[PDB]
Amino acid sequence: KNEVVVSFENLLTEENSQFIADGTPNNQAFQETDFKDPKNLINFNHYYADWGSGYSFAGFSYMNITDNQTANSPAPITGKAKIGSVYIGVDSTDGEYGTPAILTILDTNYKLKGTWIANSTWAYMGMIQGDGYARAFKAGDWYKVTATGYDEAGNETGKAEILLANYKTDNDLPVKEWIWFDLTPLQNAVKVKFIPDSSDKNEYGMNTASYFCLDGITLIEK
């Protein structure tokens, strides 16, 4: 069964750049658009706005941003992509005003094999020292990403999970590397939703940044 790695290389011309929607960002609400990879394998949804501090995204975004020092950076804590220079930034929430990151496989001969995943700098900084809204992690805290698969009609096909932090003691740290997230348990999913969660949460949702990163998204033939 042939494997293909989705790539957004050769799309960004400048350093420290990201996908920018065709529409006009506003400070009222997120607007939604989509982008597909150059091989027309997967459609990724993308939310965008500008609340007054510059372009703000949710859902998926391809970028080459390397800043792993600024407290609110969407860049992986590694400060670099797993493969090449381009990776995918994800800001995903579920619920009422939720902006979930849901990809759709377009070349339906393929299913997802998996992906590399890493913590965003924003989520990592929140866990190691807090960020006002988020509090520093201690024994018992965790950070998770759950992938839910669906068929074309939207019927659930399977679910997979991975931890990006799991503090057994006050002295532990979140995952600082790219790690492999096996997505074959989603079965023949066409649509895949990625939702982050944290032990640092309340009634309104999670306090740790709902930002994480993906790279080397791999498809395998069914």
Ligand SMILES: [Cl-]
């Ligand atoms: Cl648009």
Ligand code: NA
């Ligand atoms: Na990459």
